[PDB]
């Protein structure tokens, strides 16, 4: 007998090998997925007083330490984060219900206006100088030949009212680019940051539109504990406020439509 | 070209000579070519 | 631009070939379908000829093929062969003037061989030609030289230092694709192996080369183009080699490949010595036959018009 | 309305940056920078400087040699008529040694140029590999690139070198030409019984679709959180921000689970490396182990049956 | 259940349609009006694919009927039905299932939209999704329409749709020569390259050799500039990758849209416009 | 000489460096091209085996 | 000369360096283009065997 | 005409390093190219079968 066809050939067993390595892979990636946001929040944990920490399958991976350059620290993941109150109240006491923000929605710091507490220190260049700084601090930087200089354009909110005018431009010392617009606010002549991501240009007009917030809201932009640099904490606090206007800045972004 | 009126007279002169010299070597090579093997 | 480019409008004519959902379908241009139909028009028949009369071989001097024809019918057959092969030239094209019986001019020794070529075609290859059969016209189209006759080609030039790629060129032979540009000589003249697919899943019993696969692919592109169709016309591309999943046209094409091997081998190559340089390619090989020659871009020559049944003189015995 | 972060609408310059300093041994850097206002329209406007060591120069060297053999051969094939070369370029190519030769080194005029271009190309590719590892070490970083490049090199080697040798025939490697190499691909599938029923090529296809899905999703995400400096993935990875939070949450509310700013890059990495790794496996088995994938799939009962509505009798059996 | 930083964002509102009606969560999925519609379209769709597997092409007792995961397949009606609704048991089922799939995808997209509105993030994801939805529509709606019949759509079956792709592709003799096809393939490939490069970079910097600290933006740029003399930069690579993937889908949609309706001949022949220019 | 006198002034409008390097670039191209054209035609001086039948003074 | 009137003011609208560079480029392109067109049609002046046979000047 | 009374001045205009390196590259390239071209025409000097047969008898 020189013909006993074997039913299992190298392709079968190699597809088997694949699937096994695959399963181990999937599991592993799902473990890296829980280095943040975990263990979850249920009323299972609170009902049980905590004896039910929510983690699911697979489980959480041993902490990993990131050693920040420049006397920066040591970060871990997963870590234990202190709970933080919610600046809102349950739309329903029933589970899975959303919460309505407490007070003036843009002030709430809840919803599209929420944000975490990032360090109260600055991101740094390789050298260790504040990465994000204004062009006034970053002497060297310069507009690109043929690009309207933002400096001096008018910042205008979502309803067409002037907000202020661009008093300067913040830039990345690590990856040369416009990160922030500075706004000398009209209504109180105080200085605020405006993320580039929220700013639209109107070059022929030398304007800088903002669908995000209303001209007035520019008055409440979170502020810098120092005008020649900004902290990680402050970047989040700045952007999130503007983000809030996306759902709050009008009594209509709230939805529905019909 | 951030050049002065005189450093393009100098350049133009030298360029012209080198270029005509080139065209000269050229007519030389083309005549040798026509001599060994006429093409028209 | 970088022009843009080569395009047809919607909706194409469509035909479902296989089972729904399997993807075996065909698309075509209606415009070009009507023009092709008008260009592949058939010549109407000559009135049938009476008779009832003596056989051709009794009244003529050199009749070696069209023997058993009545005089009348023979005459009819001659009128058709005239308009069919060389109407601008008339009778004198294949005959020595004043002497209908002479073979002293080559186009007649050839005409003779082609009377046996058509007869053989209509009577022996029905698994291929069905009841449509062939006629002089099929290839000649009012022309002495089939417009779509072919020759083995040498490709473009190569210095003496290197040998030709055998494939890799702009060739309307192989549908413009880059496969090998003469997939005919080894398949439509000689009879090399087309098959490369293994009949076993695991290996160790199929020596087919990848190269052989590309040659089969080129040839197939030729075939597809000559009849003017796509692989779903004959195949089920999930299994090109699977005969049960193919269409009865694969069967027909199988027998056709053999038929062209016979036309090119025992009817055309032999005429190479009495034919002029004007009818010969750079290797001395002669203009021969392919599928295009007869189909001229249609699944059935002249859209399957039935010409031959009106001329009994084109059938054996 | 709101900016989409597609086009830097207003750019800024600073003197070019020659970069972080390499330790002793990593040679100087060459060339001096320039800025392209248009690249700048969509990305870092800085063009170079570049590093070129022994490795890098020896690789540029081998690689250009290989490109020359392929090209010169293509001009030769249309007779040095550069017009014709220009006309059929897409169709031009350098075919491999013919099978009559097996794995022997063949004459110049019959494929030997292909073996030389194949030789030099591979060497130049693997030298570019080493290059990227050196370039990746001088910076204290890890070898993630090098492990991926090593995966793509794996597939390459599987295509033109490993399978041919195993199959005992340089003619089985892929030929250098655009349309010619397209034909090699198609002929390849035809010869081995429809590559669609080859499972490894299905997975590799799932991973290619997946590299498109993942980069599309992640990229769309990061731009959508580009208002929170989400592109600055490094610090969102060390000091999680509302960018990485809104990002992870968008997906959480849509499909029920999510990853993190650091981990999505692991899903992406592994999915790309996976294309090339299933792909090479797929070619490895073609002809060496399985000869007719459609058949293989039938043997494992995966191939569908349809009502046989059209069929043809087999002349080989008459 | 929520992430450990999720409650602070679970705001009310943002719908397009529904308002407080379906404005709630279920586990980790957000519901919303389009989720309810979506779940309906989806469930009925799948449940019908289940009935098709149950009945088979010739009836539940036939040998072609099957529950084998690789072979179950629901195919469209014959072309003879043109754009009409065809009987349920003759490709009708496939039509309905299609309506459900299209509706589920469009619902899904709109739900990601309500979700962007909630979180205050850009709408890049559902826009990008809409390219796959577009691709799906040419493959089931546009193309078969331009072609006077829904039967030109691909079947819903794991390998049967592979067979579909195969024979439709081969109707054009050598599909690889489709120029839009060549484009789309290049984008799918390039996408695969950028993805592998970005992945590698981030993982190579946020996790360096032991003994080194988290790397920097300066490192990032210095590396790809070291190797290939250019670094498109962090932001932009997220921009490019999105370009590559969306374009890959685009050119796939156009590469198949032109295969029939705008081109009926074989595809390599298309390239004739290039061998025939009056330059040669 | 047929030409202008204000013909040097052209180097106040066009950068001389570029014009210079460019000329050589273009000329090298044209040189190689034309050579290849001739090499592809009847004027070829290589593909014939003369005066000693190199590929058939030992081969053939 | 001019077109008429005031075709000097045209250079108050179109950059001279660019118009120049553009023309040189274009003319070079157009030239190569036609040379290629004529050789590709009947008017070829190279692969004609004119005025005397060359490759078969390597034949006898 | 041989050389300017001032054709040193070209190196006040052109970088000696770049011109030198350029020359090196172009020359090496040209050498390799022409060697290849010659290797592909009659003037091949290798597969001539002279001066003494190295493949004894037949196959090889
Ligand atoms: C076609 C049939 C004949 C033929 C007939 C001709 C004819 C006719 C001609 C040539 C000419 C050329 N032939 Mg021939 N030629 C044949 C066979 C050959 C063979 C061979 C292997 O057999 C070779 C190598 C050549 C080689 C060449 C080139 C040396 C030359 C063109 C120069 C050029 O393009 O540069 C372009 C020039 C430059 C790029 C710049 C010149 C120098 C500059 C001005 C110096 C300034 C300094 C500079 C800025 C810095 C230098 C750095 C650069 C990198 C160079 N011929 C065949 C047999 N040949 C041409 C010639 O001789 O020149 C008149 C010519 O007209
Ligand atoms: C593009 C041209 C063809 C096509 C070409 C191919 C090719 C070629 C292949 C596939 C493959 C597959 N295709 Mg497809 N496919 C097309 C359109 C579709 C559509 C659709 C409705 O538009 C769907 C749902 C699918 C889905 C699938 C899966 C059956 C399978 C692997 C997907 C994958 O990993 O990709 C990347 C996506 C992901 C990883 C996301 C993960 C989601 C999973 C994989 C998809 C689940 C499908 C599920 C099993 C059945 C559908 C849901 C049922 C309704 C319940 N294709 C078009 C019609 N498809 C591969 C295969 O192996 O099949 C044999 C393969 O080789
Ligand atoms: C044509 C008939 C078959 C076909 C036959 C094949 C064959 C045969 C192959 C594929 C391959 C692939 N096919 Mg397929 N394929 C078909 C239908 C499809 C369909 C579809 C919608 O139907 C899809 C999505 C795919 C998708 C794929 C990819 C997933 C996969 C490998 C991708 C890749 O990038 O590797 C490409 C990446 C590399 C090769 C690495 C590149 C790295 C190198 C080193 C780069 C060097 C650069 C160079 C040095 C720069 C200098 C340039 C010089 C000029 C050279 N195929 C049809 C069914 N397919 C592969 C496969 O699956 O095998 C199992 C393969 O080889
Ligand atoms: C068979 C012979 C031809 C061939 C014929 C065809 C044909 C015919 C087609 C392709 C198609 C394509 N081919 Mg091909 N192709 C060939 C060779 C190749 C090769 C190769 C290496 O040679 C490659 C790489 C490719 C690759 C490609 C891609 C460019 C393209 C498909 C992209 C796509 O579908 O996006 C679109 C993505 C989608 C439609 C998915 C949409 C997602 C929807 C909205 C969501 C689905 C959700 C679903 C429910 C998920 C299930 C999850 C479960 C619920 C959990 N082909 C061979 C040569 N190829 C297809 C194309 O052109 O583009 C359409 C096509 O129609
Ligand atoms: C998951 C696998 C995917 C992938 C990954 C991948 N590709 C990679 C890498 C990785 C990880 C690298 O590390 C490497 C890279 O460098 O990335 C930018 C690379 C690479 N992928 C590339 C190509 C590539 N990868 C592909 C595919 C894939 N790569 C998969 C999609 C493809 C396909 C199939 O489409 C291609 C075409 C290259 C850019 C690069 C490898 C380059 C290389 O090996 O170089 C060899 C040598 C040369 C090319 C010679 C250099 C030629 C110069 C341009 C000439 C310059 C001349 C100069 C002016 C000097 C003057 C000359 C002197 C002689 C006078
Ligand atoms: C356009 C660029 C790429 C892209 C983009 C893209 N896709 C996306 C997104 C984006 C940006 C999302 O945000 C969205 C998502 O949720 O992320 C996972 C999505 C998506 N990408 C997915 C699939 C997908 N994308 C693909 C491809 C692409 N999508 C491109 C490569 C592919 C393929 C074929 O390669 C697939 C398979 C889904 C997981 C998800 C959308 C899922 C969804 O909307 O869910 C609602 C619908 C259901 C749950 C099922 C409905 C039930 C139906 C009635 C039955 C289905 C019938 C079906 C037609 C039969 C097919 C049978 C198969 C066996 C063939
Ligand atoms: C009858 C009736 C009442 C029904 C009963 C209900 C039933 C049956 C309940 C069963 C419950 C369960 C088990 C099933 C629910 C099934 C549902 C509805 C369908 C699943 C839908 C869905 C889209 C699944 C697709 C899964 C796959 C693999 C998708 C491909 C995408 C992918 C690779 C996923 C993992 C990676 C992800 C999620 C990346 C997202 C992601 C990206 C992309 C970032 O860029 C990013 C940046 C910074 C921080 C975070 C992120 C981030 O999380
Ligand atoms: C961490 O961050 C990172 C960096 O930052 C530091 C890096 O620098 C880097 C280094 C990155 C690089 C060097 C980038 C490398 C990119 C490569 C190699 C890609 C190759 C691309 C090319 C050669 C260019 C190809 C494209 C073109 C020529 C343009 C052609 C235009 C065409 C065809 C017509 C356009 C029209 C369409 C396509 C039709 C419709 C399209 C759409 C609707 C798409 C929509 C797109 C968007 C973006 C919204 C990485 C990896 C990184 O991860
Ligand atoms: C006129 O032109 C001038 C400028 C000279 C130059 C022009 C050059 C040009 C234009 C070239 C164009 C080239 C193109 C377009 C090439 C395209 C190539 C393509 C598309 C290739 C596709 C696939 C090819 C593959 C996968 C090749 C694989 C080959 C391999 C893996 C070979 C391996 C060989 C090895 C390792 C050799 C070993 C030799 C040993 C040591 C074994 O010998 C004993
Ligand atoms: C109206 C014009 C034509 C007339 C009147 C005509 C008449 C004849 C006659 C009377 C014969 C018998 C002569 C003999 O064998 O002695 C004959 C034989 C023959 N003719 Fe014709 N002819 C015509 C056109 C053609 C044409 C156009 C061809 C070829 C294309 C052709 C090919 C032949 C051949 C081969 C024979 C020998 C027949 C055999 O062996 O069966 N004739 N013709
Ligand atoms: C361009 C697309 C086409 C391709 C790629 C193609 C490919 C092939 C291949 C690979 C085979 C060999 C199968 C085996 O090895 O057993 C084959 C056989 C065959 N094909 Fe084609 N084909 C095409 C179009 C056509 C067309 C239009 C016809 C009919 C007119 C046709 C008729 C045949 C026949 C009859 C055979 C069997 C030949 C024999 O057994 O000697 N093909 N085709
Ligand atoms: Ba058609
Ligand atoms: Ba022409
Ligand atoms: Ba010799
Ligand atoms: Ba000569
Ligand atoms: Ba020897
Ligand atoms: Fe990223």
Which key terms come to mind for this protein?
part of a larger assembly; 8 chains; C: 317 residues; two-stranded antiparallel ribbon; 10 helices; 33% helix; 3% strand; globular; D: 318 residues; mainly alpha; two-stranded antiparallel sheet; 3 strands; binds bacteriochlorophyll A; binds bacteriopheophytin A; binds menaquinone 8; binds Ubiquinone-8
Write up this protein.
This is part of a larger assembly, with 1 copy of chain A (258 residues), 1 copy of chain B (40 residues), 1 copy of chain C (317 residues), 1 copy of chain D (318 residues), 1 copy of chain E (280 residues) and 3 copies of chain F (60 residues). Chain A is 18% helix and 19% strand. With 258 residues, chain A is an alpha+beta fold. Chain A has 2 domains: 1-117, Photosynthetic Reaction Center, Chain H, domain 1, CATH 4.10.540; 118-257, Photosynthetic Reaction Center, subunit H, domain 2 (Photosynthetic Reaction Center, Chain H, domain 2). In chain A, β11 (200-202) and β12 (207-209) form a beta hairpin. Chain B has one helix at residues 9-36. Chain B has 40 residues and is mainly alpha-helical. Chain B has a single domain (1-40), classed as Single alpha-helices involved in coiled-coils or other helix-helix interfaces, CATH 1.20.5.250. The radius of gyration of chain B is 17 Å and the shape is rod-shaped. Chain C is built from 10 helices and 2 strands, in the order ββαααααααααα. By secondary structure, chain C is an all-alpha fold. Chain C has helices spanning 30-39, 56-59, 71-85, 106-124, 126-129, 136-140, 185-189, 210-227, 248-268, 291-295, and strands at 13-16, 25-28. Chain E contains 8 helices and 4 strands, in the order ββαβααβααααα. Chain E has a two-stranded antiparallel sheet. In chain E, a hairpin with a 2-residue loop joins β1 (25-26) and β2 (29-30). Chain E is globular and about 70 Å long. Chains in contact: A-D, A-E, B-F, B-G, B-H, C-D, C-E, C-F, C-H, D-E, D-F, D-H, E-G, F-G, F-H. The structure holds bacteriochlorophyll A (4 copies), bacteriopheophytin A (BPH) (2 copies), menaquinone 8, Ubiquinone-8, spirilloxanthin, protoporphyrin IX containing FE (2 copies) and 2 more. One bacteriochlorophyll A sits between chains F (20, 24, 27-28, 31, 38, 43, 45) and B (18, 22, 25-26, 29-30, 33). The PDB classes it as photosynthesis. The entry lists the keywords Bacterial photosynthesis, Light-harvesting complex, photosynthesis. The entry is titled "Crystal structure of the Ba-substituted LH1-RC complex from Tch. tepidum". Chain A is Photosynthetic reaction center H subunit. Organism of A: Thermochromatium tepidum.
């Amino acid at each position: 007998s020189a013909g006993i066809t074997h039913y299992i050939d190298a392709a079968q067993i190699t597809i088997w090998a694949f699937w096994l390595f695959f399963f181990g892979l999937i599991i592993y990636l799902r473990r890296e997925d829980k280095r943040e946001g975990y263990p979850l929040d249920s009323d299972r944990t609170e009902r049980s007083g905590g004896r039910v920490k929510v983690v699911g399958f697979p489980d959480l991976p041993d902490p990993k330490t990131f050693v920040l350059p420049h006397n920066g620290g040591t970060v871990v993941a997963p870590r234990v984060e202190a709970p933080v109150a919610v600046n809102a109240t349950p739309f329903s006491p029933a589970p899975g219900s959303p919460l309505v923000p407490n007070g003036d929605p843009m002030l709430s710091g809840f919803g599209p206006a929420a944000s975490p507490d990032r360090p109260k220190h600055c991101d740094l260049t390789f050298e260790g100088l504040p990465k994000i700084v204004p062009m006034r601090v970053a002497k060297e930087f310069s507009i690109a030949e043929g690009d309207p200089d933002p400096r001096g354009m008018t910042v205008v909110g979502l309803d067409g009212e002037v907000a202020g005018t661009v008093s300067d431009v913040w830039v990345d010392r690590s990856e040369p680019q416009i990160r922030y617009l500075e706004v000398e606010v009209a209504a109180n002549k105080k200085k605020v940051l405006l993320p580039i991501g929220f700013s639209r240009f109107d070059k022929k007009a030398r304007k800088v539109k903002v669908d995000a917030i209303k001209a007035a809201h520019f008055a409440n932009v979170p502020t810098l504990s120092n005008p020649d640099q900004v902290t990680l904490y402050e970047e989040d606090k700045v952007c999130a406020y503007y983000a809030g206007g996306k759902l709050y800045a009008t009594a209509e972004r709230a939805g529905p439509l019909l | 070209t951030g050049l002065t009126d005189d450093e393009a007279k100098e350049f133009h002169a030298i360029f012209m000579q080198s270029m005509y010299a080139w065209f000269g070597l050229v007519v030389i090579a083309h005549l040798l070519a026509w001599l060994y093997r006429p093409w028209l | 631009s970088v022009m843009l480019l080569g395009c047809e409008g919607p909706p194409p004519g469509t035909e479902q070939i296989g089972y729904r959902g399997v993807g075996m379908e065909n698309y075509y241009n209606k415009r070009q379908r009507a023009l092709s139909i008008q260009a592949n028009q058939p010549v109407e028949s000559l009135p049938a000829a009476d008779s009832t009369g003596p056989k051709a071989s009794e009244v003529y001097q050199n009749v070696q093929v069209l023997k058993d024809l009545s005089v009348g019918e023979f005459t009819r057959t001659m009128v058709a062969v005239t308009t069919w092969v060389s109407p601008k030239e008339g009778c004198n094209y294949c005959h020595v003037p004043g002497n209908w019986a002479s073979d002293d001019i080559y186009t007649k020794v050839v005409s003779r061989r082609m009377f046996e070529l058509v007869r053989a075609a209509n009577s022996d290859w029905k698994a291929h030609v069905a009841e449509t059969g062939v006629t002089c016209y099929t290839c000649h189209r009012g022309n002495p030289v089939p417009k779509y006759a072919w020759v083995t080609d040498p490709g473009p030039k190569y210095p003496s230092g290197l040998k030709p790629t055998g494939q890799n060129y702009g060739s309307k032979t192989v549908a413009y694709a880059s496969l090998p540009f003469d997939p005919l000589t080894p398949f439509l003249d000689q009879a090399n192996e087309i098959r490369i697919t293994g009949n076993a899943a695991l290996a160790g019993s199929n020596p087919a080369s990848l190269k052989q696969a590309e040659w089969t692919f080129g040839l197939m592109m030729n075939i597809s183009d000559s009849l003017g169709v796509g692989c779903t016309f004959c195949h089920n591309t999930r299994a090109f080699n699977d005969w049960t999943q193919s269409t009865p046209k694969r069967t027909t094409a199988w027998y056709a490949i053999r038929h062209v091997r016979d036309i090119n081998q025992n009817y055309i190559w032999p005429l190479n010595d009495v034919l002029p340089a004007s009818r010969k390619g750079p290797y001395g090989d002669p203009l021969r036959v392919s599928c295009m020659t007869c189909h001229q871009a249609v699944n059935k020559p002249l859209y399957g018009a039935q010409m031959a049944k009106d001329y009994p003189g084109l059938y054996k015995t | 309305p709101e900016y989409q972060n597609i086009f830097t609408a207003v750019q800024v310059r600073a003197p070019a940056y020659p970069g972080v300093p390499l330790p002793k041994g990593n040679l100087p850097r060459i060339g001096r920078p320039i800025f392209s206002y248009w690249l700048g329209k969509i990305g870092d406007a800085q063009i170079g400087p570049i590093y070129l060591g022994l490795t890098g120069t020896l690789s540029i060297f081998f690689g250009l040699v290989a490109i020359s053999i392929i090209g010169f051969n293509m001009l030769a094939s249309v007779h040095w008529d550069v017009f014709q070369f220009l006309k059929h370029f897409f169709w031009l190519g350098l075919e491999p040694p013919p099978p009559q030769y097996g794995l022997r080194i063949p004459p110049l005029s019959e494929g030997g140029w292909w073996l030389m271009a194949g030789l030099f190309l591979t060497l130049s590719i693997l030298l570019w590999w080493v290059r990227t590892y050196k370039r990746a070490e001088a910076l204290g970083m890890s070898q993630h690139l090098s492990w991926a490049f090593a995966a793509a090199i794996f597939f390459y080697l599987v295509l033109g070198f490993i399978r041919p040798v195993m199959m005992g025939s340089w003619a089985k490697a892929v030929p250098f030409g655009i349309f010619p190499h397209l034909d090699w691909t198609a002929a390849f599938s035809i010869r081995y019984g429809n590559l669609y029923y080859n499972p490894f090529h299905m997975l590799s296809i799932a991973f290619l679709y997946g590299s498109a899905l993942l980069f599309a999703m992640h990229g769309a995400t990061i731009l959508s959180v580009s208002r929170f400096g989400g592109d600055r993935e490094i610090d969102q990875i060390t000091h999680r921000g509302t960018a990485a939070e809104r990002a992870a949450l968008f997906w959480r509310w849509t499909m029920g689970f999510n990853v993190t700013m650091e981990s999505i890059h692991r899903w992406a990495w592994w999915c790309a490396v996976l294309t090339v790794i299933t792909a090479g496996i797929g070619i490895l088995l073609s002809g060496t182990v399985v000869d007719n994938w459609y058949l293989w799939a039938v043997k494992h009962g995966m191939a569908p049956a349809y009502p046989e509505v059209v069929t043809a009798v087999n002349p080989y059996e008459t | 259940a929520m992430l450990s930083f999720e409650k602070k964002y679970r705001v009310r509102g943002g719908t397009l349609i529904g308002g407080d009606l379906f404005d709630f969560w279920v586990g980790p999925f957000y519901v919303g009006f389009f989720g309810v519609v979506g779940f309906c379209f989806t469930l009925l769709g799948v449940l019908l694919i289940v009935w098709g597997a149950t009945i088979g092409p010739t009836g539940p007792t036939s040998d072609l009927q099957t529950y084998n995961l690789w072979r179950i397949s629901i195919a469209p009606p014959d072309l003879s039905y043109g754009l009409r609704m065809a009987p349920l048991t003759e490709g009708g089922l496939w039509q309905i299932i299609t309506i459900c799939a299209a509706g589920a995808f469009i619902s899904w997209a709109l739900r990601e939209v309500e979700i962007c509105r909630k979180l205050g993030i850009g709408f890049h994801v559902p826009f990008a999704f809409s390219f796959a939805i577009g691709a799906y529509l040419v493959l089931v709606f546009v193309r078969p329409l331009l072609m006077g019949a829904w039967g030109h759509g691909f079947p819903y079956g794991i390998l049967s749709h592979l067979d579909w792709v195969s024979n439709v592709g081969y109707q054009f003799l050598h599909f690889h020569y489709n120029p839009a096809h060549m484009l789309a393939i290049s984008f799918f490939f390039t996408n695969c390259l950028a993805l592998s490069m970005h992945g590698s970079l981030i993982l190579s910097v946020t996790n360096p050799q032991k003994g080194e600290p988290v790397k920097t933006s300066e490192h990032e740029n210095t590396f790809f500039r070291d190797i290939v003399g250019y670094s498109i930069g962090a932001l932009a690579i997220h921009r490019l990758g999105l370009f590559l993937a969306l374009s890959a889908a685009f050119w796939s949609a156009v590469c198949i849209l032109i295969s029939g309706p705008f081109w009926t001949r074989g595809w390599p022949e298309w390239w004739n416009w290039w061998l025939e220019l009056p330059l040669w | 000489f047929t030409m202008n006198a204000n013909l040097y002034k052209i180097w106040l409008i066009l950068d001389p460096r570029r014009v210079l390097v460019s000329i050589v670039a273009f000329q090298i191209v044209l040189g190689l091209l034309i050579h290849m054209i001739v090499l592809s035609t009847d004027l070829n001086w290589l593909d014939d085996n003369i005066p000693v039948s190199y590929q058939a003074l030992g081969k053939k």
